[PDB]
Write a protein that binds this ligand. Structure first.
Ligand SMILES: CC1=C(/C=C/C(C)=C/C=C/C(C)=C/CO)C(C)(C)CCC1
Lengths: 100, 98, 101
């Protein structure tokens, strides 16, 4: 039912949060696009609910970015890259620890 | 904050539902696109969270439609959401409260 | 702490899934308002993250009702809010509902 979709959305949201926290924790220059792609990739592979959550969260982030001044297209490109099932590692900065 | 964002989202959502409510309350001559634009326009006026909310609701609506046209609604949605005037789609003599 | 909020939200989500699951198993007449109320009650008790998760889930449910048929919604939301505010879910308990629920 809609329950299963929502559970996937819930999982997808956590994948999104996981990507965000791992990115602060890593504090690695030019890592953002990797984590954006990775969070959307992980989330979408939870199923339709996860892919929906990743999009909704990504657009919420874009909206806040716009409001505060900037970039955004590049981020959304990385977002959609991972969400479509493409490898986030194409954005992986050299030396990024294997645990991320 | 994101408390502020979420507030705007709540308000924007209400503007949306209120748009959809009004529309049923008016079984109309070709009234669709006006209500869709107005909801988004109202919702976007609340701020970023409202614009964001209007978009998730619009896209969701469209998604459910995809088992039952959709693009023309989406044009009207983005019209209002961008701030362009919803009355552009007003039908012939639509009651004043809408 | 975002971590704590996220932890409460996860718990509250589980409380919500547990209510819906319990509702299904029980298959008891006139019982949805109880489970709607109970899920929000248990969720809100987790902390702000839980109350928030329960609202997001309740509002998403209402949204899907409206797009399709399920639409009554106001009555469901009244129960949701009732439980989420901390009021007794048993206010909606139908006669005979097994005690474990
Ligand atoms: C009020 C409001 C919401 C309602 C969302 C909807 C409409 C959820 C249903 C989605 C479905 C079924 C999508 C199918 O692709 C939530 C709380 C989520 C966030 C802010 C806007």
């Amino acid at each position: 039912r809609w329950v299963q979709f929502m559970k996937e959305a819930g999982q997808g949201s956590r994948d999104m949060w996981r990507a965000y926290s791992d990115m602060k924790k890593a504090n690695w220059k030019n890592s953002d696009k990797y984590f954006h792609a990775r969070g959307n990739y992980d989330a979408a592979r939870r199923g339709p609910g996860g892919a929906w959550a990743a999009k909704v969260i990504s657009d919420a982030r874009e909206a806040v970015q716009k409001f505060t001044g900037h970039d955004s297209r590049a981020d959304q490109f990385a977002n959609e890259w991972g969400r479509s099932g493409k490898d986030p590692n194409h954005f992986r900065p050299a030396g990024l620890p294997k645990r991320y």
